Ligand SMILES: C[S@@+](CC[C@H](N)C(=O)[O-])C[C@H]1O[C@@H](n2cnc3c(N)ncnc32)[C@H](O)[C@@H]1O
Ligand SMILES: [Zn+2]
């Protein structure tokens with residue numbers, strides 16, 4: 343099997359909805375570290391603490407703010423698409439990744455719950471194959487047709503990555519972050535049961551984890 347084709351996008355395509363968070367969180371009290379060399383808003387950050395990215399024009403740390411990862415597309419660069427046992431295609435990293443590190447934004451079309459169920463009737467044959475993540479209050483990020491390499495990341499009952507919902511300039515967007523340190527050649531995975539949507543067509547899980555749950559979704 344050849345990999346699924348899709349329309350690569352650099353950012354989310356908003357169709358019929360706006361997943362506005364309800365706050366432009368601004369202005370932490372992080373102190374700008376004195377030499378340009380080092381990066382700020384690291385752990386104590388009043389923005390980070392609530393999963394909000396800082397805004398470039400209010401943040402006391404200016405260009406050393408490391409809390410604007412998704413807005414600046416600070417995607418890792420060593421992802422490879424590969425043929426992955428019986429899971430079809432997967433994504434692995436070519437170089438070690440550290441716990442908590444941002445990996446990539448998960449990109450797609452942002453549609454309402456309704457619109458996704460139409461696509462599912464009119465186009466998808468009532469199975470999305472987990473090419474879609476819940477975003478917020480009935481909105482869905484649909485990567486079945488448009489997205490980025492993150493759509494190829496497989497499920498594991500013992501995931502080494504997770505999806506996080508961030509408020510970014512007043513809009514919910516979703517990052518993949520490492521849950522644990524990872525060496526080169528490691529396949530990326532996250533728990534679809536937590537992050538993905540309602541699809542009642544369950545599928546057998548091949549994650550191969552001692553305590554695998556046997557089924558996905
Ligand atoms: C969101 S797509 C991921 C990429 C997909 N493997 C491909 O080739 O394009 C999810 C589909 O991949 C496969 N898959 C992902 N994780 C799996 C797992 N843990 N066990 C069995 N199949 C899995 C299933 O066919 C699932 O519906
Ligand atoms: Zn800060």
Ligand SMILES: [Zn+2]
Nearest residue numbers: 383396401407
């Ligand atoms: Zn900041």
Ligand SMILES: [Zn+2]
Nearest residue numbers: 499547549554
């Ligand atoms: Zn499993």
